[PDB]
Design a protein around this ligand. Structure first.
Ligand SMILES: CCCCCCCCCCCCCCCCCC(=O)OC[C@H](COP(=O)([O-])OCC(O)COP(=O)([O-])OC[C@@H](COC(=O)CCCCCCCCCCCCCCCCC)OC(=O)CCCCCCCCCCCCCCCCC)OC(=O)CCCCCCCCCCCCCCCCC
Ligand SMILES: CCCCCCCCCCCCCCCCCC(=O)OC[C@H](COP(=O)([O-])OCC(O)COP(=O)([O-])OC[C@@H](COC(=O)CCCCCCCCCCCCCCCCC)OC(=O)CCCCCCCCCCCCCCCCC)OC(=O)CCCCCCCCCCCCCCCCC
Ligand SMILES: CCCCCCCCCCCCCCCCCC(=O)OC[C@H](COP(=O)([O-])OCC(O)COP(=O)([O-])OC[C@@H](COC(=O)CCCCCCCCCCCCCCCCC)OC(=O)CCCCCCCCCCCCCCCCC)OC(=O)CCCCCCCCCCCCCCCCC
Ligand SMILES: CCCCCCCCCCCCCCCCC[C@@H](O)O[C@H](CO[C@H](O)CCCCCCCCCCCCCCC)COP(=O)(O)OCC[N+](C)(C)C
Ligand SMILES: CCCCCCCCCCCCCCCCC[C@@H](O)O[C@H](CO[C@H](O)CCCCCCCCCCCCCCC)COP(=O)(O)OCC[N+](C)(C)C
Ligand SMILES: CCCCCCCC/C=C\CCCCCCCC(=O)OC[C@H](COP(=O)(O)OCCN)OC(=O)CCCCCCC/C=C\CCCCCCCC
Ligand SMILES: CCCCCCCC/C=C\CCCCCCCC(=O)O[C@H](COC(=O)CCCCCCC/C=C/CCCCCCCC)COP(=O)(O)OCCN
Ligand SMILES: Nc1ncnc2c1ncn2[C@@H]1O[C@H](COP(=O)(O)OP(=O)(O)O)[C@@H](O)[C@H]1O
Lengths: 320, 122, 98, 49, 459, 55, 347, 44
């Protein structure tokens, strides 16, 4: 029985599964801070499901076989060449930012679906709520246009208004010279090109917009670089939080039913990401669109609905 | 504007009076029944195409049910339609018979005695 | 016909006209709808009493029941309009055009 | 191949398939019997056979 | 008539179940086979039409039209498969499906026993044609062309629908045999005048009559090659066939209701022929030529004599073959140089000699050289018009001259002189193109030997 | 003068222009119920006079 | 809204319509209309926002005015004959008032202003309901009292409906307003043949409901409400846009499609009653509806509009919910003309 | 050489609140993407 109105009528409820450690948690921080290790440790301690940060190929991880697809059929953007040529006049920068917002929206829907269906909590790296720091950084560095920011704000205004914000917001704080130190010691030849003004912009956006905004409907836990290797101490700090602040205590079974009907049905989640606003950076012409769609449908498991591709070994197609 | 609703001795919601059984039923190879089956087959194919399943191969039990449902309903539709046309003709003939002064038989002329007008093409 | 019947039909026409020609407040139009119902109740009651149709004495009560439902429905919508705009003005509801 | 449930897996739902095929078969036999009865009643009413 | 029809329908799933690389082969083979079977409708009784059944019948008027339709389908497939090579398998199958549905609608329309069925099929031909033009048309202008083609046609055909249902209410039948045997004169009244107009204007706009012809240059120029072929060869003839059928219930009113249409058709013959002399587009020139030829057919049908009906039938068939050939010839060069302008490529006889021969023969049949059937039809119509009034020879004579002028103008501009120096991508003619031209031309020449087959019922 | 201008002007361009004008007149309503309802009153008065007095 | 509450409200809407359809007493017909409106107002506001509130408010005002007028007509009819049975109205003035009330309930011109606004203000599911199920009750009432009605008023409103539907539809880019003007023109067609043959009214209504259900379900499946948003569907679901193209041509009334059957049947019936002129106008005017259907088909299926980069992510996901009756509705909307003589079973 | 398909400037003819824009309907703005208008600061 697929979840729907009939399942909600006879029996199924959400509140009977929420058991005090549901707690959507997100672990934010600037570039190359150790937020990922802390997130994995928090998830392992508290027993929550961990979500590695959504990248260009996050959607590939969830459909077909979890293998990534080619960049021209999925994403059509490059993080490496954003570091090499951030001002390229092919619109790679805003295309990347918009695709990454869409990926994070999809992951937020997946995490909320997990939480609302199994009761077990989730841990996210960044979110649709903190995605804008990169947008503001790019815009202040002259990487994207004013129109790209306006389009981003439109898409966000119509998408992010549908979900519940996280219970806990964990911010790993690392100053920018330490960030540059870690970047150079890492080894990635592209990340070497990241200027100090860019990281400073990301950090300013974080500390002046994101944390003051989330602190109104969420409780915030800031941690410097050194006090963040103590995963036991962070988990102890989270276990003694009184979540009495945001919209989560205002949620009964009917609001949960609406949200659970929305977080499944990924097409309804992604609906407003492709709104007919014709920015040159993200608009694709009819001929390229047709070519790339035809090439997508020739991938070995993509021509038909999941259980109907015999090229991938499916059986009883006539009887399904 | 409502010609057959008020006809006498008509049961409200029968769809098939008992008098209809005096009429020959439509044959099972009636071309209208074959067309109804073809409609059901097209419904099955569009069903496969919308759900992104192989169009001619995917659900054979489903396509069979489509065709069977269309043929089943079409049989009774054809019975009712033929019965209604039989009623129309019955009533029309009875009315012509009972009102002979409105449908007179006048002697018809051969064309040798009817003077028709001639119009030359030139 | 009798003078009394003419007056009641005139009351219906006046209330109908009042409903049709809006001013600023919605509540005034709701009142006009109620007025129409009141005149319908009076007219049907006079006709029923005069002809002594005994079983039809219950239909004006049914009329009142439905009138109450309509009135309740109207007030709910007014509550929602006022919550949106802080005012029950007709001019505010111009978002949708033809 | 596929990562998760894929609710229709390698085997088809035999309950739903059986019910669909049974519905089709029952409809067809009911229709054949109905047509036989119609033909016989029509012949009886008009005295053909 | 079922024997011709079912196989045509069969063509549909045969192409939908074929392998991706065999669609053209299969469709062409079985289209040719269907054309051969149809060839057997040319046996005609004499006194009356062959009535296969209550629903379908074939005539001597009808038989030539059906054979031309069935023969045109494989030629359209040969002409299409070049510019459709880059297309996906599904869209190629959809294009072929459009062509097959068009053939099916056309065959039924010509053989329907009664007018309501004729009307429904005659109108159903609009959908595949519109889809072909607007989906596979090369230019942006195709959308406008599609609208013009649709609206001009429906504005004429809806009054026809009203008139037909009224006529069946007053007469009791629309079956063509009953319509003919029980024909009675049309009085001279305003009601009958408007009934005449409603019975005639749809076929007038299909021909097209001069002044209601503006949809045709748009639609014929903006369409893909097969769309243009079927629009000129067959779809224009729906108007002529329908008019020849319908004018049996219109006597004796036609005697004077025909005057404005005759004036329009004769003067507009002169007008469209003169227009062809100053045309910068090569498809535009062939379209206007079609208009000029159909004006002649309109005159022939309006004057209502046996010689004029014979000439109209012959001219319809001959025009259908010649106009399709000319469109294909223009399309080969367009495929080479990707422009429709006539002076872009010059002196092509130096580069493509056999194609120049095809050009010469098509231009010679367009100007109605004896003893081609183009001249047979034109001469019969001109004689009937002379009997109608001796002054028509002046207009007819003038038209013959202007037609020779623009035909040879097109030939000289495209084939003679020196080649444009810059264009260097003119490859040798393919076997496909030469065979397409021959399959247009050989049938026309063969028809001269047996003129009576295309002559019609009056013969 | 004839094909590209006047034959265009009389039949198709006139039709387009007229239907475009009538569409703009019909569809450009301000969405105010006061105006719509006022018209309903006008319509009701007309019917009960030029239709209800005629039988 | 709780699912159980939504089911109860849909059942109350349908039961009010059925009460209108099974009743012999004018009071019970009025009660059916009241119950239908009462349950219908919440269904319009199911997805709460200011536009849905405004749409429900305009709807309530229009329908309650119509209800008062309907009741007044019933009471005048009772005054001039002690009758409650719905047969043929006894008083001419009561019949005029009744006709105008039912025209307001249907949205016939000149009472057409509410239909586009309310349809635009609500969701596609509520629009589907409003434009299909909300027509049955007033049409059934009009079919019952058809002999009594004056032809001049009815045909005036019907011709106005056709004209205004065409003209108003020409100017729209929102799909819900296009559907609403389409509905207005279709209602004009249904009511033009009513004083002559109610079977033709029923046939027209059935075919219109089939085509409208198909169109609304296709618009829900490809969750688009503007022209430009529907211009993207080709780059995700081409079959949907092809099926919509064919359904659009059927709505236009072009032969050999089903949509042509109602127009064909109505014109023929009218000619029998010596009415050549009204039909010629009606068909030539429906050409406008065909024009804006063709424009939508141009932008949606016959050409390819530019697309966006984020569409690639949608390429990877199947539709979560599938409509069971959508395939059948398309086939009945397009391929049913050869079955035309089956209309005799409707009388 | 390829078939012509609509581009951004062609598509934008259908992006306004209305076809056939006049001087009055020029200041009509298309409705929000979801059918949700921004709340008003009508402070009670
Ligand atoms: C009248 C003569 C009788 C001769 C008897 C034998 C005739 C057999 C021919 C059969 C039909 C011809 C097929 C036409 C397509 C051409 C195929 C081709 O590509 O050639 C390649 C071939 C290979 O050459 P190549 O070296 O590789 O290079 C070729 C280059 O492309 C370029 O090379 P090219 O420059 O040499 O061009 C090829 C040639 C080919 O181009 C053509 O135009 C040939 C077609 C003629 C004009 C077509 C339209 C005009 C309307 C007339 C309709 C008549 C049809 C009758 C029935 C025919 C049955 C098919 O062009 C011409 O020669 C000039 C054409 C001018 C002809 C004017 C004559 C007017 C009417 C004459 C009488 C007609 C009625 C007969 C009876 C009258 C009363 C007794 O060249 C040839 O074989 C030359 C063709 C022979 C010329 C025929 C001209 C007269 C025949 C007319 C019809 C026959 C009537 C028979 C009845 C008995 C009398
Ligand atoms: C003939 C004329 C031609 C045809 C007529 C025109 C057709 C137009 C029909 C439009 C219907 C609208 C609609 O249902 O949804 C639109 C729907 C689109 O919605 P969607 O996008 O799919 O998703 C909507 C979700 O449901 C989102 O909503 P959700 O998440 O809340 O999902 C809840 C869902 C799932 O439902 C449940 O959860 C089931 C749980 C059961 C709860 C128990 C409640 C029972 C207690 C209430 C009892 C009330 C009794 C009333 C007493 C009255 C006293 C006088 O329930 C529903 O969706 C609606 C249920 C509909 C109930 C139908 C039952 C028939 C009632 C008959 C009443 C007559 C009684 C006798 C009258 C006697 C005279 C007085 O359209 C379609 O899906 C396809 C169209 C199908 C139309 C019918 C086909 C043609 C005819 C065959
Ligand atoms: C009057 C004379 C008779 C007429 C008959 C009646 C008319 C025909 C029947 C109508 C209904 C039947 C088909 C409906 C389902 C089709 C849906 C579909 O998607 O098809 C794809 C499907 C192929 O897809 P696939 O194989 O999975 O792989 C393709 C790739 O995946 C890639 O696939 P994809 O999905 O990715 O490609 C997407 C594509 C998909 O686009 C479509 O497929 C269009 C389908 C629209 C359905 C039409 C609505 C319902 C039918 C109404 C017809 C109206 C006719 C009146 C005039 C209006 C003209 C439309 O869309 C596009 O590419 C955009 C192009 C836009 C161009 C504009 C054209 C759109 C409208 C054209 C409609 C023309 C009429 C239908 C033609 C046949 C279509 C199969 O079609 C088939 O393969 C099956 C077709 C029929 C085969 C069954 C044959 C029977 C069994 C064989 C034995 C013979 C029996 C006799 C025994 C003899 C004794 C031995
Ligand atoms: C686009 C095609 C239209 C599709 C229409 C929907 C088809 C599916 C609906 C389900 C079929 C069951 C309906 C009836 C079953 C039994 C009920 C029966 O008793 O009803 C009788 C009546 O039978 C029905 O009316 C017949 C319904 C048949 C509808 C199909 C005809 C469509 C016309 C041509 C198109 C071909 C359609 C092809 C079929 C898929 C009652 O007679 P009566 O109470 O005295 O009349 C009431 C109306 N009056 C008084 C005003 C006259
Ligand atoms: C650009 C291409 C468009 C297509 C071309 C369409 C052609 C349509 C033209 C119709 C041909 C003639 C129509 C009717 C025949 C005679 C018309 C009339 O003028 O003749 C006199 C009629 O007398 C007067 O002229 C009355 C008619 C005058 C009013 C009509 C207005 C004409 C103005 C031109 C408008 C253009 C029309 C086409 C619109 C595009 C004859 O005198 P009378 O014997 O007593 O009447 C015969 C009828 N009776 C027997 C019933 C009595
Ligand atoms: C009384 C009422 C009678 C109703 C008659 C209706 C005739 C049917 C034709 C409908 C034409 C509608 C044209 C229209 O409204 O707009 C003109 C249109 C607007 O362009 P849009 O695509 O809408 O917008 C693009 C920019 N965003 O401008 C054009 O370029 C039109 C191009 C195609 C026009 C086709 C006209 C063909 C007419 C042929 C002649 C017969 C027409 C019908 C009347 C016949 C005479 C009695
Ligand atoms: C693409 C452009 C094509 C334009 C074609 C337009 C012209 C079509 C021909 C006229 C159309 C309407 C004719 C009506 C259909 C015939 C029905 C009929 O014959 O009935 C007549 C009825 O005749 C009429 O009512 C027709 C009157 C005209 C009404 C509509 C006027 C539309 C414009 C008329 C002039 C245009 C026609 C030629 C224009 C050609 C295109 C340029 C007689 O029946 P009764 O009423 O019973 O009379 C005897 C008993 N008392
Ligand atoms: N929304 C985004 N916009 C641009 N770049 C992003 C975005 N999200 C992640 N990245 C890139 O991901 C890279 C590494 O991710 P990060 O979480 O900062 O470090 P770690 O690998 O330790 O998890 C960074 O170089 C960053 O630029």
């Amino acid at each position: 029985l697929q979840y729907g109105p009939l399942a909600f009528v006879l029996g199924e409820r959400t509140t009977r599964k929420l058991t005090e450690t549901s707690k959507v948690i997100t672990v934010d921080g600037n570039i190359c801070s150790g937020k990922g290790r802390l997130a994995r440790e928090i998830a392992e301690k508290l027993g929550l499901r961990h979500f590695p940060e959504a990248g260009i190929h996050y959607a590939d991880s969830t459909t077909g076989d979890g293998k990534p697809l080619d960049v021209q059929l999925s994403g059509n953007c490059s993080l490496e060449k954003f570091y090499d040529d951030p001002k390229s006049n092919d619109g790679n920068s805003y295309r990347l930012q918009s695709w990454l917002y869409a990926s994070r929206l999809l992951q937020y829907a997946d995490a909320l679906e997990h939480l609302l269906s199994t009761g077990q909590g989730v841990v996210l790296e960044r979110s649709i709520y903190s995605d804008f720091v990169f947008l503001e950084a790019m815009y202040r560095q002259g990487f994207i246009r004013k129109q790209c920011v306006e389009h981003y704000n439109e898409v966000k205004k119509v998408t992010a208004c549908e979900y519940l914000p996280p219970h806990v917001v964990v911010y790993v704080d690392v100053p920018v010279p330490e960030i540059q130190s870690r970047i150079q010691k890492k080894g990635n030849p592209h990340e070497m090109k990241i200027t100090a003004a860019y990281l400073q912009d990301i950090e300013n956006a974080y500390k002046k917009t994101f944390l003051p905004e989330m602190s109104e409907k969420c409780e915030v836990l800031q941690y410097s670089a050194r006090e963040a290797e103590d995963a036991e101490k962070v988990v102890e700090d989270i276990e003694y939080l009184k979540c009495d602040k945001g919209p989560w205590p205002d949620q009964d079974d009917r609001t949960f039913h609406r949200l659970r009907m929305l977080v499944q049905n990924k097409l309804e989640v992604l609906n407003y990401t492709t709104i007919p606003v014709y920015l040159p950076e993200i608009t694709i012409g009819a001929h390229q669109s047709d070519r790339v769609f035809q090439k997508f449908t020739e991938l070995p498991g993509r021509k038909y609905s999941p259980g109907y591709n015999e090229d991938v070994g499916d059986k009883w197609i006539w009887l399904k | 504007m409502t010609m057959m609703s008020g006809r006498p001795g008509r049961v409200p919601l029968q769809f098939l009076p008992n008098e209809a059984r005096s009429l020959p039923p439509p044959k099972l190879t009636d071309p209208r029944l074959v067309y109804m089956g073809f409609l059901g087959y097209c419904s099955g194919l569009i069903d496969n195409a919308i759900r992104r399943r192989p169009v001619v191969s995917a659900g054979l039990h489903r396509q069979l049910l489509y065709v069977t449902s269309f043929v089943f309903f079409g049989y009774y539709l054809l019975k009712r339609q033929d019965y209604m046309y039989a009623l129309r003709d019955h009533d029309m003939f009875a009315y012509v018979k009972s009102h002979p002064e409105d449908f007179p038989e006048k002697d018809k002329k051969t064309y040798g005695e009817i003077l028709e007008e001639f119009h030359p093409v030139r | 016909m009798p003078l009394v019947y003419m007056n009641i039909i005139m009351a219906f026409a006046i209330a109908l006209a009042g409903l049709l020609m809006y001013r600023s407040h919605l509540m005034s139009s709701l009142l006009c709808l109620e007025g129409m119902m009141l005149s319908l109740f009076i007219m049907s009651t006079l006709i029923i009493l005069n002809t002594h149709f005994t079983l039809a004495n219950m239909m004006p009560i049914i009329l009142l029941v439905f009138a109450a439902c309509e009135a309740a429905l109207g007030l709910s919508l007014l509550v929602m309009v006022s919550n949106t705009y802080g005012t029950d003005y007709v001019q505010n509801l111009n978002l949708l055009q033809c | 191949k596929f990562y998760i449930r894929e609710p229709p897996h390698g085997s088809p739902d035999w309950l739903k398939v059986g019910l669909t095929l049974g519905t089709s078969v029952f409809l067809w036999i009911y229709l054949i019997k109905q047509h036989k009865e119609d033909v016989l009643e029509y012949k009886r009413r008009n005295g053909l056979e | 008539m079922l024997k011709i029809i079912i196989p045509t329908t069969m063509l549909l799933p045969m192409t939908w179940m074929s392998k991706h690389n065999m669609i053209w082969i299969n469709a062409t083979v079985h289209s040719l086979l269907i054309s051969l079977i149809s060839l057997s409708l040319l046996n005609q009784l004499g006194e009356n039409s062959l009535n296969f059944s209550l629903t379908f019948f074939s005539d001597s008027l009808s038989a030539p039209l059906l054979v031309l339709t069935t023969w045109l389908l494989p030629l359209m497939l040969m002409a299409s498969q070049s510019h459709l090579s880059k297309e996906t398998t599904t869209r190629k199958k959809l294009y072929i499906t459009m062509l097959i549905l068009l053939q099916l609608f056309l065959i039924m329309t010509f053989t329907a026993t009664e007018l309501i069925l004729f009307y429904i099929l005659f109108e159903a031909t609009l959908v595949p044609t519109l889809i072909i033009i607007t989906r596979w048309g090369n230019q942006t202008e195709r959308l406008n062309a599609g609208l013009y083609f649709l609206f001009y046609t429906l504005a004429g055909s809806l009054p026809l629908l009203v008139a037909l249902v009224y006529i069946q209410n007053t007469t009791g039948s629309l079956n063509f045999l009953i319509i003919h045997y029980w024909s009675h004169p049309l009085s001279n009244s305003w009601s009958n005048i408007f009934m005449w107009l409603a019975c005639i204007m749809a076929f007038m706009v299909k021909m097209p009559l001069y002044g209601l012809h503006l949809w045709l240059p748009k639609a014929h120029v903006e369409a893909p090659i097969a769309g243009s072929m079927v629009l000129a060869a067959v779809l224009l003839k729906l108007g002529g066939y329908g008019m020849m059928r319908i004018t049996t219930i219109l006597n004796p009113l036609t005697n004077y209701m025909a005057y404005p249409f005759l004036m329009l058709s004769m003067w507009g013959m002169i007008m469209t022929s003169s227009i062809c002399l100053r045309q910068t587009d090569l498809k535009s020139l062939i379209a206007y030529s079609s208009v000029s030829h159909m004006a002649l057919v309109i005159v022939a049908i309006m004057i209502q004599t046996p010689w004029s009906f014979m000439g109209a039938t012959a001219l319809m068939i001959a025009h259908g073959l010649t106009s399709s050939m000319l469109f294909c010839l223009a399309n080969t060069n367009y495929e080479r140089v990707h422009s429709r302008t006539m002076i872009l490529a010059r002196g092509l006889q130096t580069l493509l000699p056999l194609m120049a021969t095809w050009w010469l023969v098509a231009s010679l049949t367009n100007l109605a050289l004896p003893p081609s059937i183009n001249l047979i039809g034109e001469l019969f119509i001109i004689t009937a018009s002379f009997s109608w009034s001796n002054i028509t020879i002046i207009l007819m004579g003038m038209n013959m001259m202007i037609t020779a002028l623009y035909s040879l103008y097109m030939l000289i501009t495209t084939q003679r002189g020196k080649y444009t120096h810059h264009i260097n991508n003119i490859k040798p003619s393919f076997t496909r193109e030469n065979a397409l031209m021959a399959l247009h031309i050989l049938p026309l020449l063969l028809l001269t030997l047996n003129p009576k087959m295309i002559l019609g019922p009056l013969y | 003068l004839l094909d590209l201008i006047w034959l265009e002007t009389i039949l198709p361009k006139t039709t387009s222009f007229i239907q475009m004008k009538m569409s703009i007149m019909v569809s450009n309503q301000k969405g105010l119920i006061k105006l719509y309802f006022l018209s309903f009153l006008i319509t009701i008065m007309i019917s009960m006079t030029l239709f209800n007095y005629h039988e | 809204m709780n699912p159980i509450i939504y089911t109860t409200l849909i059942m109350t809407v349908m039961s009010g319509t059925m009460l209108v359809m099974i009743s012999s007493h004018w009071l019970l017909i009025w009660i059916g209309f009241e119950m239908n409106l009462l349950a219908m107002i919440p269904v319009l506001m199911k997805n709460f926002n200011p536009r849905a509130t405004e749409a429900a408010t305009k709807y309530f005002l229009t329908q309650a005015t119509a209800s008062m007028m309907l009741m007044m007509a019933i009471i005048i009819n009772l005054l001039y004959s002690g009758q409650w049975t719905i047969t043929k109205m006894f008083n001419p003035v009561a019949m005029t008032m009744m006709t105008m009330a039912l025209a307001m309930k249907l949205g016939l011109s000149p009472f057409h202003f509410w239909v586009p606004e309310v349809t635009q203000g609500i969701s596609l599911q509520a629009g589907l309901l409003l434009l299909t199920w909300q027509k049955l009750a007033p049409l059934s009432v009009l079919c019952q009292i058809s002999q009594s009605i004056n032809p001049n008023l009815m045909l005036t409103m019907a011709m106005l409906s056709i004209l205004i539907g065409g003209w108003g539809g020409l100017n729209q880019t929102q799909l819900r307003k296009i559907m609403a003007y389409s509905s207005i023109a279709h209602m004009g067609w249904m009511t033009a043949v009513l004083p002559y043959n109610t079977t033709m009214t029923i046939l027209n209504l059935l075919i219109y409901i089939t085509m409208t259900l198909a169109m609304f379900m296709l618009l829900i499946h490809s969750s688009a409400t503007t022209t430009l948003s529907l211009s993207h569907t080709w780059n995700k679901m081409p079959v949907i846009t092809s099926l919509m193209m064919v359904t659009l041509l059927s709505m236009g009334g072009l032969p050999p499609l089903s949509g042509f059957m109602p127009k064909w049947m109505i014109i023929q019936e009218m000619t029998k009653n010596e009415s050549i002129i009204m039909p010629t106008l009606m068909a030539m005017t429906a050409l406008l509806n065909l024009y804006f259907y063709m424009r939508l088909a141009y932008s949606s299926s016959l050409t390819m509009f530019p697309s966006t980069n984020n569409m690639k992510m949608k390429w990877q996901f199947e539709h979560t919910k599938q409509m069971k009756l959508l395939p059948t509705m398309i086939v009945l909307s397009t391929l049913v003309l050869p079955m035309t003589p089956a209309l005799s079973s409707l009388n | 050489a390829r078939q012509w398909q609509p581009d951004v400037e062609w598509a934008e003819q259908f992006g306004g609140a209305v076809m056939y824009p006049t001087k009055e309907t020029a200041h009509w703005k298309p409705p929000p993407w979801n059918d949700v208008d921004p709340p008003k600061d009508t402070l009670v």
